[PDB]
Design a protein around this ligand. Structure first.
Ligand SMILES: Nc1ncnc2c1ncn2[C@@H]1O[C@H](COP(=O)(O)OP(=O)(O)O)[C@@H](O)[C@H]1O
Ligand code: BEF
Ligand SMILES: [Mg+2]
Ligand SMILES: [Zn+2]
Lengths: 15, 390, 605, 263
């Protein structure tokens, strides 16, 4: 149902 | 871990450590799940058994557990292939164990441990002891360089501070045990006592050090009998983390304020709250001092106020992410010493030298397009000798 | 003032700890900073009291902070509070006690209200007070006597020097109570403005008006609400209560049109009464009970055109019972503040959402219009569903190596164009629009630099709005964007950062900005902050993106301009990279395209 | 953790017969094997708890709720209570010629409620996996089938294992119990070497029992017989009231007295 994108949903930091 | 420490020991000391029954029970208890049953099996047996039988006693499912337990106990040298009978001393000594042959304390341990941490930081009000001071300095977490002046904190000392009290104490004990042999204290005696505690001159000195750390307390002017504290055998949080890089530490102890001040700027002080802001300057200083970001997040994570526990993640992701970016910001330039080779006229031989460098493990980076590579100066002579040989 | 070893203001010799501190959620330092807990059982009661006496400084979701200032206290007495009530409840709320310095400070700034009053009648301004002594003290002041026109005692004061009179009155600890008794003012005819039953004001809307109309008389001050909260409805309601001729001062031609639409939608006033005073056209401002205009039109300093001059003459020679001032934070400007004196108004109502400025002139609103009557909490409204939930983010776009080569060397103010026209930044903007458009989201893109605005608009072939665009043309785009499914994304400039009502705009993107303008950022985010139809409180209905160039001066400004939003609890998640960009056919995928773009940027100079 | 329970069948008649027979196997050794087995279980981990229960023709009594020998201090206390309690039970007992068969369902009933009583006491943080290591040593009683059948279902509902270790006689009813509740069965023929079976087959807990090779389950003959004869019947007739397996068609079953109508 129009879920949030991956970058917004979860942290994109390498660490 | 405790089992890790035992593995890194010689067979001679191990058998010596397998003395009074309590030690065998202590070493037995850490057998994870499987090897415990195996120990009871070949306990009344005086005849060695084939290694194949042991392998086939664990179903194909969860087979990895069969090997790992066997490898662990082989390191412990509990049995020997004998071609798998247990150690005769262990079997006998274990058989002796197996039917053969308070509120004030915790506060004392917490306070006595705290004053040591107070001394670790530049706290003027901390316990003073020459033996303790040299112990920490020789423990690898502190350095003085001038006996008259109070010692400072090394890079690892700052990291040691943020570690949780259980891990903080265990690491100190692990370092103490290793240094016990160097100073002339037998490792078996102190190590055996620790196992016995979980349930001579060397012990008297060892007991005094344990008393200093607050793990043990005689309470009777250093009598023969001692009353170990909770920490000797082996808490709600107070920090509120805001999305705007603000920490409200519900702390009354000065040590916790000192800890938080390592990586944040203190703004206001209240009895049951201290306002601290996590500025990049403080964080970058903390990272520069030796701290690692994960510890900072973990240190705040463990000391999380109950109100934040319900939220998931308890620490807002932005604060956690921002801290990591501050750490990664400092290390943008990865400096690495090496020796560069250029003017590779022999293009065909460049690959051969490339293969030779790779075989030796000296090559760090290479560029086939530009026909160049970088090798650490340690292996520079080897490649230089190879080039000279032709 | 004692400082601890860790550069911390030690306040342990200053205040004690209350035994029942667990129930009491409030801290009161001698510096005046008040730290309230958002998780306490009694938060609701404390927040209403605290926000009135002290303007919030930062209000995270867990622990809020407030600061005490003379102006902040002056608002508390106006709404109806008293020194004894404030200090008593403050001590009751304080878990550590009120230090003697603060306790006397509260008393000091409470014995100044009501001493002197300013009354406008028959196009004449008078300094009214029931105590002759305070009036006599004012007369001793030189400038107060200078601006004088050249029981209760009143002396007339010239209109042109009202600002200086009010400013010195505060400096003399005798604020002027510019309170309008509309209900007992039959001189000005009552207008047929009425609130239709279909219009119901939300609790925060009603509460804000309650402070304005706590007593029979109407209070003049600044009411602050988050963008999209519905300040239009509150302003219309204020006119409905006053029932007198109302003048509305918007920010631009778009603001007045939305003001006109809101009045018709939220009031029974006929279309004939509603009028506009703008360069585009005028609906006969000479005859109109409600006037809508812009600060530029009224504040225009040079000689006016004949069409505008005739309206200006009527406006000056008129009496207004309520002057709604949209975008109050622009009032302290050098010329826009003059509009207050040019027009004669009894009660000046100020509506805004970002009561912040990069200068120190924001405090002038205390006497230019009045004290900050109300300030709603953004998170409180966000959780209530009155404003759409926004997931603020900062897309970190690495700078192109060719561009950075020039950026580091160049320092003659040409950097702004260089890092604003970053191909890497462009690709992220291009990818985001494509992805969000596929999700049936209404995108808005902002850019301070028109050059960048134009560069991106044509390249993506999307409508763009900025200065030269005619009012009708820009109005057409908004109507198309509001309703036309085809126009799913629009490009806007500094013009549309304020007063643009786009309820369905779920997504927002920003590629440029004017320095660290917290007002710009918060106002820009306001466009998508309007409540959505199918909005859910905890579903992040709207989204905001602030594209930035890594290792660039833009990073410092991005942090600077995020100060206000974070103070309201908004967290700016950092997006180092965007997934799926590689598998997308985005522009500037070759060095030749980027190389060509760099030369064009350099040519612009 | 695990709550092991050793329901030892200390039947004086059967064990006394061994004393009269002067066989190598004796009750004293059996209690020692149970003692060593009990000590090992607690020896595995601190959290582990156990209990010991005896059986007699009269009644069953619990055998269980410095380091002089050098062993662990806690195990020393367990040995003292068990050693003294068993001797008191064996030495002191009445005589009843009418009742001479050992009782096991009653002893188990005391066991099943003990875990439930202990299950309530244990804190919510720690989950407990209790077990009952019934060690049968005599033939079953005919009249105790119904009573024994109820306790077994209670164990299955509450998920307690019955790892029967019968010896000297294969109890047809007991081997039925272990199968229903998932418990293990073993008929040790080498009574002198009984303990080694315990440390191998019965000592490992349920969570580890799966990841281990153990003797395969023995076929369980779920025999049904008519209440006339007590002879196995493959096709049984029952009514909706008695629920009684019957010999053949009858106009009315005696145990019911119902006015059954032909059709
Ligand atoms: N009480 C209300 N009931 C219904 N819609 C409302 C209400 N208050 C505000 N709105 C809607 O919210 C938006 C407010 O826009 P506007 O008045 O320009 O906000 P602001 O002046 O706060 O920026 C419009 O879509 C308006 O119709
Ligand atoms: F705060 Be609004 F956009 F007028
Ligand atoms: Mg508005
Ligand atoms: Zn029947």
């Amino acid at each position: 149902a129009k879920e949030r994108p991956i970058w917004l949903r979860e942290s994109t930091v390498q660490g | 871990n405790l089992q890790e420490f035992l593995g890194g020991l010689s067979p001679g000391v191990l058998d010596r450590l397998y003395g009074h029954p309590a030690t065998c029970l202590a070493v037995f208890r850490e057998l994870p799940s499987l090897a415990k049953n195996w120990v009871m099996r070949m306990l009344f047996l005086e005849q060695p058994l084939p290694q194949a039988a042991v392998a086939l006693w664990v179903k194909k499912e969860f087979s990895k557990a069969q090997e790992e337990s066997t490898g662990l106990l082989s390191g412990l040298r509990i049995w020997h292939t004998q071609l798998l009978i247990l150690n005769p001393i262990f079997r006998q000594n274990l058989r002796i164990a197996l039917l053969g042959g308070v509120p004030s304390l915790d506060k004392y341990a917490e306070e006595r441990w705290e004053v040591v941490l107070h001394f670790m930081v530049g706290s003027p009000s901390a316990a003073v002891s020459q033996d303790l001071a040299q112990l920490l300095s020789q423990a690898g977490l502190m350095k003085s360089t001038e006996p008259g002046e109070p010692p400072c904190i090394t890079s690892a000392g700052f990291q040691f501070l943020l570690l949780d009290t259980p891990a903080q104490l265990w690491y100190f004990m692990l370092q103490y045990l290793q240094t016990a042999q160097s100073r002339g204290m037998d490792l078996v005696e102190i190590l055996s006592f620790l196992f016995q505690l979980s349930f001579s001159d060397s012990l008297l000195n060892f007991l005094q050090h344990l008393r200093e750390f607050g793990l043990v307390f005689q309470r009777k002017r250093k009598s023969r009998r001692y009353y170990p504290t909770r920490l000797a055998i082996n808490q709600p949080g107070f920090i509120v983390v805001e999305t705007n890089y603000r920490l409200y530490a519900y702390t009354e102890s000065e040590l916790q304020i000192a800890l938080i001040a390592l990586f944040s700027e203190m703004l206001y002080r209240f009895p049951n709250m201290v306002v601290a802001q996590v500025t990049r300057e403080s964080v970058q200083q903390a990272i520069a001092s030796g701290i690692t970001a994960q510890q900072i997040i973990h240190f705040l994570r463990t000391r999380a106020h109950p109100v934040m526990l319900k939220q998931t993640p308890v620490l807002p992701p932005t604060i956690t992410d921002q801290i990591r970016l501050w750490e990664l910001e400092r290390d943008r330039l990865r400096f690495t010493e090496g020796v560069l080779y250029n003017q590779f006229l022999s293009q065909v031989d460049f690959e051969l030298l490339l293969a030779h460098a790779r075989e030796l493990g000296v090559l760090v980076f290479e560029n086939s397009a530009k026909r160049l590579m970088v090798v650490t100066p340690a292996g520079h002579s080897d490649v230089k000798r190879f080039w000279k040989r032709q | 003032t004692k400082v601890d070893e860790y550069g911390a203001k030690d306040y342990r010799l200053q205040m004690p700890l209350k035994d029942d501190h667990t129930s009491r959620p409030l801290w009161v330092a001698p510096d005046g900073h008040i730290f309230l807990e958002a998780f306490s059982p009694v938060y609701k009661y404390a927040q209403d009291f605290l926000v009135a006496i002290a303007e919030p400084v930062c209000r995270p979701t867990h622990v809020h902070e407030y600061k005490l200032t003379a102006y902040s206290l002056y608002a508390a007495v106006s709404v109806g509070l008293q020194t004894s009530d404030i200090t008593e409840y403050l001590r009751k709320l304080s878990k550590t006690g009120v230090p003697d310095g603060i306790m006397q400070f509260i008393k000091l700034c409470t014995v100044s209200y009501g001493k002197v009053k300013l009354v406008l009648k028959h196009n004449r301004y008078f300094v009214e007070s029931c105590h002759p002594d305070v009036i006599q003290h004012l007369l001793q002041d030189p400038v107060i006597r200078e601006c004088r026109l050249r029981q209760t005692v009143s002396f007339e004061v010239k209109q042109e020097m009202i600002e200086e009179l009010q400013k010195r009155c505060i400096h003399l600890e005798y604020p002027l109570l510019a309170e309008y008794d509309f209900r007992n003012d039959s001189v000005n005819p009552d207008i047929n403005i009425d609130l239709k039953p279909t219009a119901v004001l939300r609790p925060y809307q009603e509460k804000s008006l309650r402070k304005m109309f706590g007593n029979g008389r109407a209070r003049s001050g600044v009411i602050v609400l988050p963008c999209g909260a519905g300040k239009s409805l509150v302003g219309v309601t204020a006119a409905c209560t006053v029932r007198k001729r109302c003048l509305v001062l918007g920010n631009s031609a778009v603001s007045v049109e939305q003001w006109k639409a809101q009045f018709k939608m939220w009031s029974t006033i006929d279309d004939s009464q509603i009028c506009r005073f703008t360069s585009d056209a005028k609906d006969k401002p000479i005859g109109c009970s409600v006037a809508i205009s812009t600060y530029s039109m009224l504040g225009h300093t040079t000689k006016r055109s004949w069409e505008a001059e005739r309206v200006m003459e009527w406006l000056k020679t008129q009496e207004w019972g309520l002057m709604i001032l949209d975008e109050v934070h622009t009032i302290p400007a050098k010329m826009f503040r003059r509009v207050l004196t040019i027009v004669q108004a009894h009660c000046k109502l100020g509506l805004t959402a970002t009561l912040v400025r990069e200068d120190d002139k924001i405090v002038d609103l205390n006497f230019l219009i009045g004290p900050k009557l109300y300030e709603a909490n953004w998170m409180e409204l966000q959780n209530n569903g009155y404003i759409a939930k926004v997931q603020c983010a900062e897309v970190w776009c690495p700078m192109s190596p060719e561009f950075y080569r020039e950026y580091v060397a160049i320092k003659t103010k040409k950097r702004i164009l260089l890092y604003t026209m970053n191909p890497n930044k462009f690709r992220a903007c291009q990818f985001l629009i494509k992805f969000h458009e596929r999700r049936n989201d209404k995108i808005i893109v902002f850019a301070d630099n028109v050059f960048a605005l134009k560069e991106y608009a044509i390249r993506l072939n999307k409508p763009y709005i900025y200065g030269p665009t005619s009012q009708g043309e820009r109005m057409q785009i908004l109507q198309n964007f509001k309703h036309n499914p085809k126009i799913n994304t629009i490009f806007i400039s500094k013009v549309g950062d304020t007063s643009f009502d786009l309820p369905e705009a779920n997504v927002l993107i920003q590629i440029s900005s004017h320095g660290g303008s917290r007002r710009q950022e918060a106002q820009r985010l306001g466009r998508v902050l309007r409540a959505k139809k199918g909005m859910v409180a905890e579903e992040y209905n709207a989204f905001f993106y602030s594209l930035v160039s890594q290792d660039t001066q833009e990073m410092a400004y991005s942090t600077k301009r995020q100060r206000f939003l974070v103070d309201q609890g908004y967290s700016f998640k950092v997006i180092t990279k965007l997934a799926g960009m590689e598998e997308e056919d985005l522009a500037f995928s070759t060095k030749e395209e980027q190389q060509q773009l760099l030369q064009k940027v350099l040519a612009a100079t | 953790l695990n709550l092991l329970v050793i329901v030892v069948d200390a039947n004086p008649i059967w064990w006394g017969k061994q004393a009269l027979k002067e066989s190598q196997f004796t009750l004293s050794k059996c209690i020692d094997a149970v003692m060593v087995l009990g000590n090992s279980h607690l020896f595995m981990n601190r959290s582990n708890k156990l209990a010991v229960i005896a059986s007699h023709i009269q009644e069953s009594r619990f055998l269980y709720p410095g380091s002089k020998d050098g062993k662990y201090e806690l195990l020393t206390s367990a040995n003292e209570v068990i050693v003294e309690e068993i001797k008191d039970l064996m030495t002191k007992s009445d005589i009843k010629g009418q009742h001479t068969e050992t009782l096991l369902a009653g002893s188990l009933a005391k066991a099943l409620c003990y875990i439930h009583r202990m299950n309530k006491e244990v804190k919510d943080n720690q989950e407990m996996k209790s077990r009952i290591l019934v060690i049968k040593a005599a033939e079953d009683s005919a009249l105790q089938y119904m009573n024994f059948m109820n306790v077994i279902f209670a164990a299955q509902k509450q998920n307690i294992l019955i790892d029967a270790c019968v010896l000297d006689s294969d109890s047809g009813l007991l081997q039925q119990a272990c199968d229903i509740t998932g418990g293990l069965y073993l008929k040790v023929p080498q009574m002198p070497s009984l303990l080694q079976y315990l440390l191998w087959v019965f000592l490992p807990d349920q969570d580890q029992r799966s990841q281990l090779i153990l003797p395969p389950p023995v076929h369980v003959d779920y025999r049904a017989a008519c209440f006339c004869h007590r002879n196995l019947i493959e096709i049984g007739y029952v009514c909706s009231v008695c629920l009684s397996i019957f010999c053949n068609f009858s106009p009315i079953c005696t145990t019911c007295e119902t006015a059954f109508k032909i059709s």
